[PDB]
A paper describes a structure:
ADP-ribosylation is a reversible post-translational modification involved in various cellular activities. Removal of ADP-ribosylation requires (ADP-ribosyl)hydrolases, with macrodomain enzymes being a major family in this category. Further analyses reveal DUF4804 as a class of MavL-like macrodomain enzymes whose representative members show unique selectivity for mono-ADP-ribosylated arginine residue in synthetic substrates. Crystal structures of several proteins in this class provide insights into arginine specificity and a shared mode of ADP-ribose interaction distinct from previously characterized macrodomains.
Thus, it appears that the arginine insertion contributes to packing interactions outcompeting ADPR binding. Mutation of R370 to alanine, while retaining normal (ADP-ribosyl)hydrolase activity, led to successful capture of ADPR-bound MavL, with well-defined electron density guiding unambiguous placement of the ligand. H142 and Y265 interact with the adenosine via π-π stacking, yet a commonly present aspartate in other macrodomains stabilizing the N6 atom of adenosine is absent in MavL. Furthermore, the proximal ribose is held by interactions with the backbone of G221 and P264 and the side chains of T224 and K236. The di-phosphate mainly interacts with the backbone atoms of the loop containing residues from G223 to F227 (referred to here as the di-phosphate binding loop, loop 1): specifically, the α-phosphate with C226 and D332 and the β-phosphate with G223, G225, and F227. Another loop from D315 to D323 (referred to here as the catalytic loop, loop 2) is responsible for the distal ribose binding in MavL, with D315, N322, and D323 directly forming hydrogen bonds with hydroxyl groups on the C3”, C2” and C3”, and C1” atoms, respectively. In addition, D333 forms hydrogen bonds to the hydroxyl group on the C2” atom. Mutations of D315, D323, D333, or F227, to alanine resulted in a significant loss of activities of MavL, whereas N322A and T331A mutants only exhibited activity loss with low enzymatic concentrations. From the same structure, we observed five ordered waters around the distal ribose, three of them (w1, w2, and w3) above and two (w4 and w5) below the ribose ring. On the other hand, the substrate-associated w4 is bound to the phosphate groups of the ADPR and further stabilized by the backbone of A313 and D333, and the side chain of T331. This water is the closest to C1” atom (with a distance of 3.3 Å); accordingly, we propose it to be the catalytic water and its possible activation by the α-phosphate of ADPR for nucleophilic attack at the C1” center following an SN2 mechanism.
Author numbering: 37 to 409
The structure:
């Protein structure tokens, strides 16, 4: 079979149901794919009905582009993606082991790790409440006549984050360690739209609700370091056995960065995981495919070997600028037209890896297996 993939795509049981309904609607001629999904379908040979659910899902995920800003560059009307596709893509997360080269500070605030540290990233798209065009799938889902609904937002983040929490619980267990997870203010910046001034407490409440509800499934998760940067009160509380900390590093001096061990954890006792505020439509690291070390997604990708994990190439970390650069051979000359998205174009890289679903018993399994049982 294929070579091992450094990255793994996960999704919830409810997202699998949406995928099955979509696949069946296409098979019956009730749905039209978006043009980008159609483009990826046309590069393989199978009809929708002949391909299986995992291949079908992979091809939809493959329609993502290296850099695309959901808040401003998407129409939601089939000329790019449809709302039915967007509902699915927003639920898909991706994890990968990484080397972390700095603590994740934005701009020039980053602090280099003397020795690069090992851990993991889990890219998860936030609730998309911004658009340069019409309303989004997430807006339809979590707003009632324009008002945010906490219970509906809770269910959305539950769908999106629980598969990764379950994954890293099991990974901590099999590594005979506990998990420390750093989390940013997902959805509270570029994705917040008109809700910028009110969204922050909703996200913190959603995280607390998911951890309270599922604590029995997360015995190897130990520390949750939630850093909304600004706009939430510093706090520490116990959620069952788990230490949940609200540590906004934009207002409090001397907080640990997203790509660093929170207080109480170290490499011998914990695996280190950071959630990344991702994008429905882009590859992990979005902005930084275009050379921009900007936003949680672009900063964390640039500050790790994310792009090496996705492309398979060996990049070179630049200490002065806090960013993992393309291979020296690619950068040497090239007219400076040599960022990672340029690398993708000339080497025909695609984003496509293994995908698993979280079944109703709390086990990650193949789409085929979950759908049948
Ligand atoms: N200087 C800073 N240092 C640290 N955190 C900061 C800083 N400035 C803002 N934050 C916090 O960073 C947190 C994350 O805000 P965002 O990165 O916009 O994420 P989203 O989920 O809303 O938008 C996702 C889109 O943005 C990307 O392009 C993706 O690819 C998507 O296209 C917030 O708490 C900020 O307050
Ligand atoms: Na609740």
């Amino acid at each position: 079979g294929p070579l091992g993939s450094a990255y793994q795509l996960l999704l919830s049981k409810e997202t699998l149901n949406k995928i099955l309904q979509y696949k069946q609607n296409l098979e019956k001629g009730l749905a039209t794919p978006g043009k980008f999904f159609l483009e990826e379908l046309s590069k393989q040979e199978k009809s929708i009905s002949e391909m299986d659910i995992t291949t079908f899902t992979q091809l939809l995920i493959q329609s993502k582009k290296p850099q695309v800003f959901a808040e401003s560059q998407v129409y939601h009307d089939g000329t790019d993606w449809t709302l039915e596709e967007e509902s699915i893509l927003g639920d898909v997360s991706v994890n990968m082991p990484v080397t972390m080269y700095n603590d994740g500070g934005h701009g020039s605030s980053f602090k280099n790790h003397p020795k690069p540290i090992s851990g993991y990233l889990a890219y998860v798209p936030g609730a998309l409440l911004a658009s340069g065009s019409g309303p989004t799938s997430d807006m339809k889902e979590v707003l009632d006549n324009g008002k945010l609904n906490q219970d509906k937002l809770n269910a959305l983040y539950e769908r999106r984050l629980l598969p990764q929490l379950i994954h890293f619980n099991e990974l901590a267990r099999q590594n005979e360690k506990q998990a420390a997870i750093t989390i940013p203010g997902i959805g509270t910046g570029c994705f917040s739209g008109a809700y910028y001034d009110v969204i922050k407490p909703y996200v913190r409440n959603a995280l607390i609700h998911i951890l309270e509800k599922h604590k029995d499934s997360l015995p190897y998760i130990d520390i949750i370091h939630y850093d909304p940067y600004m706009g939430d009160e510093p706090a520490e509380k116990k959620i069952g056995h788990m230490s949940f900390r609200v540590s906004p590093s934009g207002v409090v001096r001397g907080t640990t960065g997203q790509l660093d061990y929170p207080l109480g954890s170290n490499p011998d006792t914990h695996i280190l995981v950071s959630i990344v505020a991702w994008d429905h439509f882009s590859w992990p690291g979005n902005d930084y495919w275009g050379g921009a070390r900007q936003t949680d997604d672009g900063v964390k990708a640039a500050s790790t070997d994310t792009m090496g994990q996705v492309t398979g190439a060996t990049g070179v970390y630049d200490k002065k600028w806090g960013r993992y650069m393309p291979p020296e051979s690619f950068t040497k000359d090239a007219k400076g037209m040599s960022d990672w998205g340029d690398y993708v174009r000339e080497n025909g890289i695609v984003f496509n890896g293994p995908v698993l679903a979280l079944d109703k018993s709390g086990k990650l399994d193949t789409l085929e297996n979950v759908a049948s049982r």
